[PDB]
Design a protein around this ligand. Sequence first.
Ligand code: ACP
Length: 323
Amino acid sequence: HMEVTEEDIAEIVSRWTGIPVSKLLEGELLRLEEELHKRVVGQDEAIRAVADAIRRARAGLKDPNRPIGSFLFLGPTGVGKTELAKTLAATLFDTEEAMIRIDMTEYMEKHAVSRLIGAPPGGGQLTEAVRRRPYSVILFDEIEKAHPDVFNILLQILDDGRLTDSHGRTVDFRNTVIILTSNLGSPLILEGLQKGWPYERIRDEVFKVLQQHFRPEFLNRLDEIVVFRPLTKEQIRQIVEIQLSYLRARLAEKRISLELTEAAKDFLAERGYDPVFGARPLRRVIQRELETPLAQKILAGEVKEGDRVQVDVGPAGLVFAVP
Ligand SMILES: Nc1ncnc2c1ncn2[C@@H]1O[C@H](COP(=O)(O)OP(=O)(O)CP(=O)(O)O)[C@@H](O)[C@H]1O
């Protein structure tokens, strides 16, 4: 039957049950890694770890009273942790609105548990969010900064697959994916390399800090611990291309094409990435170095509807030409 699609029936069931369409159609998942890789460049280990856990859950091999998966993402800033969490949410649960982000720097000071689960009688940021979206990816950023009382609430999620809030009502976490992140150790490695420390010192100091913050009792609860890697030159270039996608689409409305030389791509990659911030700088590098001067060319009439635009490097920055 052709006229009524799989999506038609899935949408009916989804609206009646609250189960996301992609969840209902999970089986009609074996290429989850390739789907995640459409947005997340590299970090193959993280993608495989997440995909492996989801498969074990779908195959009926895990404890049904725990979340679908739980992970600790270690490694540096700006290399794909949040991008993977956002992409996973969009892929598993149809929208990035299915990602719930808890910034643990806002939960450091003792009375923060009431912020998480609701003030005691006489609601909570986490509990209310998960009640209204049981099918969600939950991202806890910078977990080592959480107050112990807040950290104990995370342990409850991992152990019981549920939380009781301050109203006394149980909040179901069994359909969530829990992603915990920390950059712990990464600034220390940068400090050692700047100071000229030998690798042995750097290594030993990273392990003692990890030992201090992350104990086996905690870590044993997790599906996997994954250390994100710094990005290679080729990976940063692929990220530049992904980050030009929306610009190209907007330009294509006026039939304008952009053709970047390899040097122009390398210009953006060089400025858009560093060890401290990862690829966090790239968006505003593209805005400043490409979009702004392109805007001036369009407004001046030098770049017109229908033009193919060559983008190359000059010593003042990127330069433009229409052949
Ligand atoms: N592996 C990757 N694949 C695709 N894009 C990536 C990427 N790593 C970084 N980016 C780009 O750089 C930005 C920053 O990456 P991301 O948000 O994943 O880092 P992060 O989780 O460390 C952010 P924060 O420092 O705020 O916690 C993303 O919005 C994305 O555009």
